[PDB]
């Protein structure tokens, strides 16, 4: 994706003799980090920490609905929740790798 084949073959004579000399290091373009490969334990720990860092009871029970509920129903409604995450959302992008066991 970042470098499709089709570039002209490198010529030593052109790089040495011709003026101005043409080398792949002459014209350089800044490159953003395309992707990274994280360890599975780091992925799991980061997911757990991020999930527990955004657990707001006030967000799950918006007013004025939460003001007309007894204790048991409120605690029952706060019992369960779920979260979803995406690879490309992180900077830089992450790619999963492992062995199916």
Describe the structure.
- By secondary structure, the protein is mainly alpha-helical.
- The chain is built from 4 helices and 2 strands; from the N terminus they run H-E-H-H-H-E.
- The protein has helices at residues 12-16, 40-53, 57-60, 71-77; strands at residues 35-36, 93-94.
- Strands 1-2 form a two-stranded parallel ribbon.
- The longest helix is centred in the middle third of the chain and has 14 residues, at 40-53.
- It is elongated and about 85 Å long.
- The PDB classes it as replication/dna.
- Keywords: telomere, C-strand, complex.
- The entry is titled "Human CST-DNA polymerase alpha/primase preinitiation complex bound to 4xTEL-foldback template".
The percent range for helix content is 25-40%
Tell me the distance between the termini.
Answer: 30 Å
**Side-by-side strand order of the widest sheet:** 1-2
Describe the main β-sheet briefly: 2 strands, parallel
Cα-based radius of gyration, to the nearest Å? 27 Å
- How much beta, percentage-wise? under 5%
Write down how many β-strands occur, each being a DSSP E stretch of 2 or more residues.
2
Give, in order, the helices and strands. HEHHHE
| Structural class by sheet pairing and helices | mainly alpha
Shape: elongated
Count of helices? 4
Topology of helices and strands:
Blueprint (H helix, E strand, L loop, with lengths): L11 H5 L18 E2 L3 H14 L3 H4 L10 H7 L15 E2 L7
Q: Can you describe this structure in just a few lines?
A:
The chain is mainly α and 101 residues long. 30% of the residues lie in helices and 4% in strands.
């Amino acid at each position: 994706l970042l470098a499709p084949p089709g570039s002209p073959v490198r010529n030593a004579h052109n790089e040495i003799l011709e003026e101005p000399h043409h080398c792949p290091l002459q014209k350089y373009t800044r490159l953003q980090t395309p992707s990274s490969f994280p360890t599975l334990a780091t992925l799991k720990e980061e997911g757990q920490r991020k999930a527990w860092a955004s657990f707001d009871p006030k967000a799950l029970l918006p007013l004025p609905e939460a003001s007309y509920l007894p204790s048991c129903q409120l605690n029952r409604r706060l019992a369960w929740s779920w979260l979803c995450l995406l690879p490309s959302a992180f900077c830089p992008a992450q790619v999963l790798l492992g062995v199916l066991v």
